[PDB]
Amino acid sequence: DAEFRHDSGYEVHHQKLVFFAEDVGSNKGAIIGLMVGGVVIATVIVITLVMLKKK
């Protein structure tokens, strides 16, 4: 509400993407998924090599 701006998110070539966002509906969560999934990869790898540092 009160967006007003009309130059992004607004014209017909920008709406087909808002409609693709509703259908999929993970538009927020998918991007956080890639992020915090990446924290878990990086944390598990650095842990497991410092255990393998004793070899």
Chain-centre distance for alpha carbon 12: 24
Annotated binding-site members for Cu(2+): 6, 10, 13-14
Binding residues: 6, 10, 13-14
Q: Tell me the two tokens of residue 44.
A: 């598990």
Residue 5: inside a domain: no
DSSP calls for 16-31:
HHHHHHHHH--TTHHH
Are 9 and 17 in contact, with CB atoms under 8 Å apart? no
Instruction: Give the method of determination.
Output: NMR
In a domain, 45, yes or no: yes
Residue ranges for the known binding site for Zn(2+) are: 6, 10, 13-14
2, part of any domain: no
Domain count, the chain: 1
Report helix, strand or coil for 33: helix
Report which residue type is found at 24.
V
Query: How far is 55 from 30, CA to CA, in rounded Å?
Result: 39
Q: Is residue 19 in a domain? A: yes
Q: Which domain holds residue 16?
A: 12-52
